[PDB]
């Protein structure tokens, strides 16, 4: 005869959702709140076990989305609000040593430290965040919402944050170098905390991400579905050099008692348009690898074309990102312009101060100007492409830079992670009868 026996502490897990806490080693993301990360992150490699992963149905991405939005919202509350700034702005063009006609010189009235006294000041504003009301202009956000001036003492540097599951839960890391994104993983490992996930905010190009292990990897929920964005991960990084050689000057205007508005005083020196440089040789070989990998899924003897974005808002039609505090919006039409069968590329870029992060409305933000020449170097470690269909596919495929939401961007880092709830209780038969 057989008898049931209760086993406590069995290595059994079940898929579930939980709130993982942050961990990290004067920045928008709360550093003091995050618990100090373990200097020796344990990683136990599990043998003879295969787990089924799912990057699209992973709740970690959604939780990260909520946490990043919450941190961004709370990071703006302890500083200056630009609600009285909406006023009639008398503006003209800036033609002092210029090659681009965008920038504008606006003068307007503003409050001072005293409620009964005003002041007439001036500030240089770009044409993107200024709209004509009728030589009379106003801010684009006045008819939408009062922007909250970003705190100047906090930095926008995306420091890496480690997501750690709480007690009773574990994180499974798929170490299969050829991970396809979903499906069974023949090599998993338990980790208390994930690797450094830099919350880089960008569209059409995954900057400062994690590179592939062996070759370029293409992932998508449905390759045959045109409405699903195609995530691409490079095995080698494509260095990008972005800069703003304007050398802006910041001026503090006392908008109210104890609160100041940082404005762009004057642009000393020759005014030049911002731009990003990418080596055409590295980009050429990278695109060659990408098309070679694409042909694996779409078959051989098919011409694959790379065209620019179809259209839409400036946030989706251009590679938006943050560099040294300033928010860039670069036109990537020069990169995705080619067709495959069988020196440096300069990308014109534009800068905007009034921004609407997370594709939301009613909670805009004003990025204050940064003094000096801005210059930064990033690693293009991935892409977000969108394929368009055709009649019988017409032996061709067109891919355009997809301006998908931030979940797709953050999914490229959490593709090899999943949270599982431990179930230490278990019952199994055994030949033994409890003594009465």
């Amino acid at each position, epitope marked *: 005869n057989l008898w049931v026996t209760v086993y406590y502490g069995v290595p059994v897990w079940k898929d579930a959702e939980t709130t993982l806490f942050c961990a990290s080693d004067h920045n928008v993301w709360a550093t003091h709140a995050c618990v100090p990360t373990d200097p020796n992150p344990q990683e136990i490699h599990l043998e003879n076990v295969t787990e089924e992963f799912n990057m699209w149905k992973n709740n970690m991405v959604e939780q990260m989305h909520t946490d990043i939005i919450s941190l961004w919202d709370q990071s703006l509350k302890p500083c200056v609000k630009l609600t009285p700034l909406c006023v009639t702005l008398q503006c003209t063009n800036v033609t002092n040593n210029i090659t681009d006609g965008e920038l504008k010189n606006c003068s307007f009235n503003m409050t001072t430290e005293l409620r009964d*006294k005003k*002041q007439k000041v001036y500030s240089l504003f770009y044409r993107l965040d200024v709209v004509q009301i009728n030589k009379e202009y106003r801010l684009i956000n006045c008819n939408t919402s009062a922007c909250t001036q970003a705190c100047p003492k906090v930095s926008f540097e995306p420091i890496p944050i480690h997501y750690c599951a709480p007690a009773g839960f574990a994180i499974l890391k798929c170490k299969d170098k050829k991970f396809n994104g979903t499906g069974p993983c023949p090599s998993v490992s338990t980790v208390q905390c994930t690797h450094g996930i830099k919350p880089v905010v960008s569209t059409q190009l995954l900057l400062n991400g994690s590179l592939a292990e062996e070759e370029v990897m293409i992932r998508s929920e449905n390759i045959t579905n045109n409405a699903k964005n195609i995530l691409v991960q490079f095995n080698t990084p494509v260095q990008i050099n972005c800069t703003r050689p304007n050398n802006n000057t910041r001026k503090s205007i006392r908008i109210g008692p104890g609160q100041a508005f940082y404005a762009t005083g004057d642009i000393i020196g020759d005014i030049r348009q911002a731009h990003c440089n990418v080596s055409k040789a590295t980009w050429n070989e990278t695109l060659g690898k990408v098309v070679k990998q694409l042909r694996k899924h779409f078959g051989n003897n098919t011409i694959i074309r790379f065209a620019n974005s179809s259209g839409g808002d400036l946030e989706v039609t251009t590679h938006s990102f943050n560099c040294g505090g300033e928010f860039f919006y670069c036109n990537t039409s020069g990169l995705f312009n080619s067709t495959w069968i069988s020196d440096s590329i300069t990308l014109p870029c534009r800068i905007k101060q009034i921004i609407n992060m997370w594709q939301r409305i009613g909670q805009c933000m004003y990025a204050p100007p940064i003094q000096g020449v801005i210059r930064c170097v990033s690693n293009i470690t991935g892409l977000i492409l969108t394929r368009d269909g055709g009649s019988t596919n017409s032996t061709t495929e067109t891919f355009r830079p997809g301006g998908g939401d931030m979940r797709d961007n953050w999914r490229s880092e959490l593709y090899k992670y999943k949270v599982v709830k431990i179930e230490p209780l278990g019952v199994a038969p055994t030949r033994c009868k409890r003594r009465v």
Partner: antibody
Amino acid sequence: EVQLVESGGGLAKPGGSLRLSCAASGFTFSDFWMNWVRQTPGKGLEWISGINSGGGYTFYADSVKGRFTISRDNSKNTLSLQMNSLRAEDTAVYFCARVDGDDYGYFDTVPGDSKKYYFKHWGPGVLVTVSS
Amino acid sequence: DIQMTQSPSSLSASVGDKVTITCQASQSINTWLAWFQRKPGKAPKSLIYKASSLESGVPSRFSGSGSGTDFTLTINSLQPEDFATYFCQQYYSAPYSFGQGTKLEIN
């Protein structure tokens, strides 16, 4: 550099009307106040009118209150001085004068009203005579 | 009104000779006074501002002094292009006032 040029002067009948115009150049006309000063032959200067950069706060001298009317057109970058009910002693060389500085900075109700100004730039002056 | 009085109404001097022009105010105007120079037929030019600061670009020979109600302009050496009408304007409190006008003529 900065240059102001006048016109509109000439002979006028007593008790009639006339208009003066002064064109500004070399500076941002929408950021500096304007004033009018006349010099009758044989005596010193006598200030007669003024206006802010935005076209408001028209302040004249007690000897020309109501009769004169100063106005400006920022778009055309020109100043005008409408005259009504002219008299014989109004015969003088009229000079349009720009204040020393801009109207930027702290202000109570009209930009530049809390700042002392002096007529840095002046026009050549046009002689206007009123006789029968 | 703060009337202004300028003296002498006319002065004759030779080339290189020092010239002094003085003008008083009916009431104290601290130091808010500026001097001017009007050549025959041409528009006036600003010479001294703040009654003591020298205008940029004007030659260093011109100099202003005085405070309160009395102010004075000095010309160390009369150059051949210095003969013209000189004015003194008060701008401490509106309405503005100007001097009667003094013309310098070569001796």
